């Protein structure tokens, strides 16, 4: 999904980027007795002031 | 048993083929002020005033980043600050073992009188600082120069932390102690555990200040390092005159600096589930000056008369030279050395298949004028040109004599202070064979540019960049220092080249060559 298209230069599939992201892992859970079968999205890795550049 | 010589007959054995002789070159020397440098990577740092006679007044601060031991921690439930201190061990020798335990020791590396205060303030930062940045597709380094005193000063938040007022020797009578800091702890089931811990700089900090910035702070704040060096951005260090005492200078490593924060909090429970608490701690560990581009050394200068006409651009004659050299370290003056009558003569000594036995430079030291001052240990000769090590330097593998004297490495290379009976200097003899054999040896070699400097420890070749680069002549620029120069507070006053210069004392290369014949 693209919320916002930047106004520079786009980088390519093997350049650096400075960044930030939020990550989480998507997990379909077992649908227990009381609890209808869901998904949930649990939290891994935050990085909210990018400091270097990490090579894609 | 017929391995001994014997000093009879000499006279009726030929004359050999070859002439050993010694040839003098002259030398031009001037003085090149050091502006602002790079203070970001440096292993050690100067906190404190020291005053020299000659030079001047420097004033030396320092700002650094602080980190986590483990982030995202626990705290607990309801804590409670009990204390918060910081310690910075300070580099000290046992000097004289004592009965009940216990040591007794001896500052070292403190420059200026023993009985000097100052008057320390340490203050929260309020200026982020980061390692390198991203620019038009490059990402660049970031270097924290000694002129940045008023940046890192003007944004700083609240009061100083070391703010108890009921022990002036923490603040507004700081002075470096040599104290063991005896703790005694009844707790071996009631039996006493006698620990020492050497010199250290113990401060007590603001409690109400760790309450909230840790105890008491949101859990995003502390979950990541990125996060947590933008919520606490560092620590500054100011030193000001404490009033009616002279003022020192030390140096410190502050990458085993931290602030230990001691708190109660309400403990794991559930199993009594009561209103006890538990005592816990969290240390705040400052960046590492080597690993981190998050450290500055503030060093501002004062400098004097002299020593600031001498190195001032208007009385520095690049054509002749200069009479006498002023080189300083840190944000002081360098030397630049020219081998250009060596040079001239170059195609004459190649022609003549001459071999160079050694070369040297020796550099007489100015002793009426460094009078009362402390003189470096050491002087440094590093290529100005290409910014890198001599030749001679890497060629020379020799150890110190005294065992675990890393400092006094190197001697053949030279540039060891050679002190007479007067317990004072007297000389500065470095040795360049290598590179005056390369010239002759190599046609296609040049004469580059040679920069005099002192220098802390003959290990540490790295260089440190300048804030603007300074351009020497039409296409030769100074950009670059020696790291080494920038650790070392002292300087001296040596004799130049200038032909106006007594022949005894004056500055000038010295050759030994072996002529064929
Ligand atoms: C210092 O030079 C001390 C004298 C060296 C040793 C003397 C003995 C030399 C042995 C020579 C043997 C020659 C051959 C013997 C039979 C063929
Ligand atoms: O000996 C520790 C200390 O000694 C002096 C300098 O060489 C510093 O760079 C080093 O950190």
Known sequence: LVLREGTGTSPMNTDGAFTSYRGEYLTRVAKTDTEAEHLSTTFFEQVLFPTKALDL | ?517
């Open chain 2, 1 to 517: 048993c017929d391995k001994d010589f014997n000093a009879i007959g000499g006279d009726l054995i030929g004359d050999d083929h070859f002439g050993l002789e010694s040839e003098k070159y002259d030398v031009l020397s001037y003085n090149q002020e050091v502006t602002s440098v790079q203070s970001n990577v440096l292993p050690t740092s100067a906190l404190g005033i020291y005053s020299n006679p000659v030079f001047g007044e420097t004033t030396a601060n320092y700002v650094t980043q602080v980190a986590l031991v483990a982030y995202a921690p626990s705290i607990g439930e309801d804590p409670v600050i009990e204390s918060a201190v910081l310690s910075i061990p300070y580099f000290s020798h046992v000097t004289a073992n004592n009965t009940d335990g216990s040591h007794t020791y001896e500052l070292d590396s403190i420059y200026g009188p023993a009985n000097g205060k100052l008057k320390l303030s340490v203050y929260e930062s309020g200026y982020q600082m980061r390692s390198s940045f991203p620019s038009n597709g490059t990402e660049l380094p970031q270097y924290y120069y000694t002129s940045q005193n008023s940046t890192f000063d003007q944004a700083k938040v609240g009061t100083r932390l070391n703010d108890d007022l009921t022990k002036p020797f923490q603040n507004d009578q700081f002075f470096f102690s040599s104290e063991e800091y005896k703790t005694v702890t009844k707790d071996s089931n009631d039996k006493e555990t006698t620990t020492y811990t050497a010199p250290e700089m113990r401060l007590n900090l603001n409690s109400a200040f760790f309450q909230d910035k840790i105890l008491k702070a949101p859990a995003s704040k502390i979950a990541s390092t990125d996060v947590f060096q933008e919520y606490f951005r560092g620590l500054y260090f100011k030193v000001e005159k404490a009033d009616g005492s002279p003022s020192n200078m030390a140096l410190m490593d502050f990458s085993k600096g931290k602030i230990t924060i001691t708190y109660k909090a309400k403990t794991d429970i559930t199993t009594d589930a009561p209103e006890t608490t538990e005592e816990r701690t969290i240390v705040i560990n400052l960046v590492n000056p080597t690993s981190s581009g998050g450290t500055a050394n503030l060093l501002q200068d004062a400098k004097s008369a002299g020593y600031s006409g001498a190195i001032s651009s208007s009385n520095v004659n690049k054509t002749e030279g200069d009479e006498r050299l002023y080189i300083k370290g840190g944000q002081g003056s360098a030397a630049v050395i020219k081998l250009n009558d060596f040079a001239s003569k170059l195609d004459d000594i190649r022609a003549k298949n001459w071999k160079v036995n050694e070369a040297n430079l020796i550099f007489n030291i100015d002793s009426d004028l460094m009078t009362g001052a402390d003189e470096p240990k050491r002087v440094y000769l590093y290529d100005l040109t290409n910014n890198v090590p001599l030749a001679d330097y890497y060629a020379d593998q020799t150890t110190s004599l005294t065992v675990g004297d890393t400092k006094g490495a190197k001697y053949v290379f030279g540039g060891l202070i050679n002190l007479g009976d007067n317990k004072r200097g007297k000389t500065y003899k470095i040795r360049i064979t290598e590179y005056i054999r390369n010239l002759i040896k190599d046609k296609t070699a040049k004469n580059v540019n040679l920069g005099l400097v002192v220098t802390e420890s003959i290990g540490i070749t790295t260089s440190n960049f300048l804030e603007n680069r300074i351009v020497l002549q039409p296409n030769e620029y100074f950009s670059q220092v020696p790291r080494a120069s920038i650790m070392n507070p002292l300087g001296t006053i040596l004799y130049g080249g200038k032909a106006s210069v007594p022949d005894d004392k004056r500055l000038r290369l010295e050759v030994y060559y072996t002529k064929p014949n």
